[PDB]
Structures are given as structure tokens and as C-alpha cells.
Amino acid sequence: EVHHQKLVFFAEDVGSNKGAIIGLMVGGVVIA
């Protein structure tokens, strides 16, 4: 009933930042 969805991403660029690929394709469908 209580949808508790928590997405936490940690990126500690202590050396040299760049660019990682993160795709959040979290999709939920329910009959109305």
C-alpha cells in the first residue's frame, strides 16, 4: 500500500571526476 522506493547513488570522485552511465528505467503499471 505504502510504496517506499528509495534509490541512493554514491559517487565519491576523490581522484578525478568523469561520467558514469546510470539508467533508471523503474516503471510500474497497475490496472485502474
Minimum gap (Å) between residue 13 Cβ and a second copy: 5
Supply angle C-alpha 29, 25, 2, rounded to 5. Answer: 50
| Whole-number Å distance between alpha carbons of 3 and 6 | 10
Question: Could you give the string, one character per residue 9-28, with x where binding to a second copy holds by CB under 8 A and - elsewhere?
Answer: xxxxxxxxxxxxxxxxxxxx
* Of 26, 19, 31, 32, the residue nearest 3 (C-alpha): 26
Residue 25, marked binder: no
Residue 23, marked binder: no
Residue positions forming the annotated binding site for Cu(2+): 3-4
Chain residues in the site for a second copy (CB under 8 A): 1-32
